């Protein structure tokens, strides 16, 4: 069942894995000096323990995971819009069977961030990170039971659910974490070199 | 492994789990004495047992028959006795539910033997004797599905025989005294 990564969820997959609270500590470090491909390798690897303890508690493996380009688009001279796009391979195995499919997995996370209008000591707002199922792509690559199988269809939606889970519950809330780690003067830095 | 709570099952006796086994249990001996039917108490047994199989596994057995107990005379004072079992068997596994339906057929087979005490020998747990014939799956039949889903059902079902419905039979024959089994050999 997905029992196990519910109760991990609620705990907080870092409680399984010390490492991970290092390389948000790294990830932090590196982000204060773009005001001043590191960021997607620390990103990288803050994805890939994620996904490492989530393997732990599920039949759903993750791994491969790449971040290919940060970027921000402005959305106004005082807001941008920050994507995080993720790619993944996926095999998911159940009890028995062993490995039933093997995915392409497409992640994008988007947050807005906001400066202040009308100061010069501007606060920051950092905008929601959605969980929205058009921004999760899974493609079927293999299924030694065959392609048009009815497991691969159940494997798909195993690993859809588990990748989900993980985005509303890991991915988003670090996302956000991360970005208000950002200061004033580096977020109005950024926010208009994105126009 | 899997098997675990079957296992433990088995070694505590399956009759543990549902009182109603001994009944059934005691209905055939006084059936069996009667012939000095029977089929239908045998049908009851094994079906009680296998609903307790249901309870430890997700190997479904029911729809249990047991069309003739055959018995031929290989003395003046000796004879094969023959179980023949089918049933339908339905497989399920975590997450997937059922996988396959299939069609099961048992042969427990064993021989008696007449002061003089009735002897009955080994019930041979041979799993030529167990056959499982696939009839339907929602994952169709090239797959190692349906191949997971009959090792499972034959594990269980020899796990059964053996622990369960060869020592049963052995039992039940031993209960018959050497004149009662004297004349139900004489009627072949
Ligand atoms: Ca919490
Ligand atoms: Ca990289």
Same mark, same amino acid.
């Given at each position: 069942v997905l029992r196990k990564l519910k109760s991990g969820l609620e705990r907080g997959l870092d409680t399984f894995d010390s490492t991970i609270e290092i390389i948000m500590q790294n990830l932090k470090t590196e982000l204060e000096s773009?005001?001043?491909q590191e960021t997607e390798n620390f990103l990288e690897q803050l994805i890939s323990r994620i996904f490492q303890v989530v393997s732990r508690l599920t039949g759903v493996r993750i791994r491969n &995971?790449? &971040?290919?380009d940060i970027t921000m688009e402005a959305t106004s001279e005082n807001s941008a819009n920050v994507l995080i796009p993720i790619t993944a391979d996926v095999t998911v195995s159940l009890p028995f069977?062993?490995?039933?499919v093997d995915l392409d997995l497409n992640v994008d996370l988007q947050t807005t961030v906001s400066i202040e209008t009308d100061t010069e000591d501007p606060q920051v707002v950092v905008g929601e990170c959605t969980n929205n199922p058009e921004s999760i792509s899974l493609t079927v690559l293999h299924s030694r039971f065959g392609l048009v199988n009815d497991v691969v269809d159940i494997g798909v939606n195993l690993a859809r659910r588990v990748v989900s889970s993980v985005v509303e519950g890991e991915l988003c809330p670090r996302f956000r974490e991360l970005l208000e780690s950002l200061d004033a003067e580096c977020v109005e830095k950024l926010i208009g070199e994105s126009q």
């Open positions: 773009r005001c001043s &995971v790449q &971040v290919p069977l062993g490995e039933i």
